[PDB]
Curated annotation (Swiss-Prot), chain A:
Lineage per the UniProt record: Eukaryota, Metazoa, Chordata, Craniata, Vertebrata
Name this polypeptide is given: Ryanodine receptor 1
Gene that this polypeptide is encoded by: RYR1
Subcellular location: Sarcoplasmic reticulum membrane
Residue numbers bearing the Phosphoserine modification: S344
Binding site for caffeine: W216
Range within the parent protein: 4176 to 5037 of 5037
From Swiss-Prot, chain B:
Modified residues (Phosphoserine): S95
Membrane spanning stretches: 9-31, 33-49, 65-85, 149-169
Residues on Lumenal side: 32, 86-108, 129-148
Tissue: Detected in skeletal muscle (at protein level). Fast- or slow-twitch skeletal muscle.
Intramembrane residue stretches from the record: 109-128
Free-text note regarding domains: The calcium release channel activity resides in the C-terminal region while the remaining part of the protein constitutes the 'foot' structure spanning the junctional gap between the sarcoplasmic reticulum (SR) and the T-tubule. Pore opening is mediated via the cytoplasmic calcium-binding domains that mediate a small rotation of the channel-forming transmembrane regions that then leads to channel opening.
Protein name as annotated: Ryanodine receptor 1
Known partners and oligomeric status: Homotetramer. Can also form heterotetramers with RYR2. Identified in a complex composed of RYR1, PDE4D, PKA, FKBP1A and protein phosphatase 1 (PP1). Repeated very high-level exercise decreases interaction with PDE4D and protein phosphatase 1 (PP1). Interacts with CALM; CALM with bound calcium inhibits the RYR1 channel activity. Interacts with S100A1. Interacts with FKBP1A; this stabilizes the closed conformation of the channel. Interacts with CACNA1S; interaction with CACNA1S is important for activation of the RYR1 channel. Interacts with CACNB1.
Residues of the full protein shown: 4772 to 5037 of 5037
Residues that hold ATP according to the record: M183, E184, T185, K186, C187, F188, T208, L209, E210, E211, H212, N213, L214
Length: 515, 266
């Protein structure tokens, strides 16, 4: 239950097994369903768009993100007066962030249910008047209290997000910047261009005293100095990083953090939610924009809409193609078929829709594309004229190419998106169930022993066990490190992932003795 | 055993097939009160014909996604209703008479009903059902309104529904194909692939029909259950105890007689 075992390619050039204790809180926080979903999304991402060389780097990054999330969850878990009450309230919002997010979705549907009882009258209950019409009389007070409650809940959602999810954003940003500083020399040798807005903005935090505040590595500045001093000037590097080399013998940081947060998509969405909730008090119908949150909420709806967004570039390109081809038909009509576009039944005021190129394009794009039979179901009958056969060819080509072919292209794009997403999921599942994540040896090898692959993935090469070992190493002070622990610790500090068993396992190595 | 009988009655009355047959009997009884209640028995073709049940499995396979897409259509049509009720109220007069205007969007409930009904059952959307926008100051806004309705509701969402059905057809087909492929390329009992047994001609067929026939395992369970324990032989009693303990290690997992004694069979 607590005996966590891994296999690492050791210093002796042989696969060896390491044993460590897994904490119960860490085990429960791993079994948490949000963490399970994070793991599932990571696995899908890697298997779908990943590489063999990049896989271990991505896996270690995912483990580090998970470890930080576990620490945040432990901080917010259930345990002068102003500070003690503030901490409890802020932690309460973080533990209940998703309940508030679901509470705001119920308040959006509750409010929009009231709005269906609206009416418009010229006379008060020329400026028109809007009012709720209900005999119960409780709908209007319910609407008022529900709008106030909804704005309150949106604000609480923003605060809970800032206390829950913003730390991970800052941790990711700091660790990426530290890695670019140390193992790439980005601001020392590379100096990113103006096109990298993120790289240009990150220059603010280098000089700050508390540059690492969420990322656990408190020796990043020392390591960057030690690596790049002899090559780029110790005094220059110290001035760049805001570190006093003589002592070796935060408004700027806060502004940087605010920029990082305000460039975050989820925070921007929550701010938009709060803004529209504030405008819902100026006009009640602005609360209808919160119904759009069902997409960002319900996972079923998000999966359904992924079929639309998967080929979104092809969909907009096909719409532009439809616009071009309807322009071509408009050219042909405006030059040869102008007389058939009279939309006025009166014999005194002809309402020609194709005596102008802009008007004929608007008429085509609107009515000939929304019509079932094309533009021939909307313009004058061609029979009897000299251009009858030309008009028939015109209408039938419009019907075939625009009504049939192009709408078929759009619908086929959606259907192909459904099929492609299904087979992506199937391929990820097949890879995971037929191959090992850590070593890549197929299940056929392990299945020689009954339940061999399940035993291998649950005991020997459990990626969860590797994550728990990283937690163990990070938490354990280096003084108490054992030999193999220090070997793996140095390989992790150098960002070298050769200690992961690649294509070799304990059974494969010692099958001779296990026979 | 009144308590046992009441328990059995509860178990039966919570059974879906028995409940369906009771519903059939109830509607047949009501067919004597009104003859047209016998039309509900035509629905039994689905629970009957296997072809019809397979066809309807395409509809029910993505049923959750279908109802979610219907709810999404309802939400987006509500949004269009909001925009119409606030900016396009004058185009929703459905009365040709010049004395009694039958406005369909002076009320939020009425405009939602009008949208959900006619703009979704219309081929061109709500612009094929409301007043022509040409000549008004809001002409371009109304054109954008109608064309977005046509693209998003008429085209995109109905395409989502039809794609859900088509993907259900394909998914069910490939499920059947994968089951057939697994059965014809691997052994049910031991899991050793047909490639191993095919070294001997007709080796896999011989293995599945003679050596590891799941039907033979079923018949052996019949044999063990029917045979009184006094007459059990040694291996029979071994398997009997393993079956009483619900331990299934006596099934050959990854090993077979040929694999074990290939040295002597050579
Ligand atoms: N190195 C690995 N560690 C853990 N599970 C693995 C590994 N490689 C493949 N798997 C598979 O991943 C799945 C884990 O199930 P789940 O935790 O529900 O995603 C099982 O099918 C395992 O056989
Ligand atoms: N252990 C097994 N026992 C019997 N049939 C098996 C077994 N493993 C695979 N099969 C296959 O199952 C199919 C039996 O055909 P049927 O009885 O019509 O379903 C054949 O393709 C067999 O090769
Ligand atoms: Zn492995
Ligand atoms: Zn077999």
């Amino acid at each position: 239950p607590y005996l966590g075992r891994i296999e690492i390619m050791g210093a002796s050039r042989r696969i060896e097994r390491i044993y460590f204790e897994i904490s119960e809180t860490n085990r429960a926080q791993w079994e948490m369903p949000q963490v399970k979903e994070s793991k599932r999304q990571f696995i899908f991402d890697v298997v779908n768009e990943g590489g063999e060389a990049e896989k271990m780097e991505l896996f270690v990054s995912f483990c580090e993100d998970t470890i930080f999330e576990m620490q945040i969850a432990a901080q917010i878990s259930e345990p002068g007066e102003l500070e003690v009450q503030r901490v409890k309230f802020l932690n309460y919002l973080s533990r209940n962030f998703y309940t508030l997010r679901f509470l705001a979705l119920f308040l959006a549907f509750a409010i929009n249910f009231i709005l269906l009882f609206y009416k418009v009258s010229d006379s008060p209950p020329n400026m028109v008047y809007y009012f709720l019409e209900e005999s119960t009389g409780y709908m209007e007070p319910a609407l008022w209290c529900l709008s106030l409650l909804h704005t309150l809940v949106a604000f609480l959602c923003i605060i809970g997000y800032n206390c829950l999810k913003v730390p991970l954003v800052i941790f990711k940003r700091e660790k990426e910047l530290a890695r670019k500083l140390e193992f790439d020399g980005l601001y020392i040798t590379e100096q990113p261009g103006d096109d990298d807005v993120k790289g240009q903005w990150d220059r603010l935090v280098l000089n700050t005293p508390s540059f690492p505040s969420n990322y656990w590595d408190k020796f990043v500045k020392r390591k960057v100095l030690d690596k790049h001093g002899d090559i780029f000037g110790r005094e220059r590097i110290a001035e760049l990083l805001g570190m006093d080399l003589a002592s070796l013998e935060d408004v700027k940081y806060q502004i940087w953090k605010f920029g990082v947060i305000f460039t975050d998509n989820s925070f921007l969405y929550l701010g938009w939610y709060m803004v529209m909730s504030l405008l819902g008090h100026y006009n009640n119908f602005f609360f209808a924009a919160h119904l759009l949150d069902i997409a960002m909420g319900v996972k079923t709806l998000r999966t359904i809409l992924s079929s639309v967004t998967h080929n979104g570039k092809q969909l907009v390109m096909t719409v532009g193609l439809l616009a071009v081809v309807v322009y071509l038909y408009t050219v042909v009509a405006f030059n040869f078929f102008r007389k058939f576009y009279n939309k006025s039944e009166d014999e005194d005021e002809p309402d020609m829709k194709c005596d102008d190129m802009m008007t004929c394009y608007l008429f085509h794009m609107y009515v000939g594309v929304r019509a079932g039979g094309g533009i021939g179901d909307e313009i004058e009958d061609p029979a009897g004229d000299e251009y009858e056969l030309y008009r028939v060819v015109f209408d039938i080509t419009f019907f075939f190419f625009v009504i049939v072919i192009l709408l078929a292209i759009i619908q086929g794009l959606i259907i192909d998106a459904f099929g492609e997403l299904r087979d992506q999921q199937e391929q990820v599942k097949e890879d995971m169930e037929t191959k090992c994540f850590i070593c890549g040896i197929g299940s056929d090898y392990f299945d020689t022993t009954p339940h061999g692959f399940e035993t291998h993935t649950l005991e020997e090469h459990n990626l969860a066990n590797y994550m728990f070992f990283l937690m163990y190493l990070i938490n354990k002070d280096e003084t108490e490190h054992t030999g193999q622990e220090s070997y793996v610790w140095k390989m992790y500090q150098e960002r070298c992932w050769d200690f992961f068993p690649a294509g070799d396992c304990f059974r494969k190595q010692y099958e001779d003795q296990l026979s």
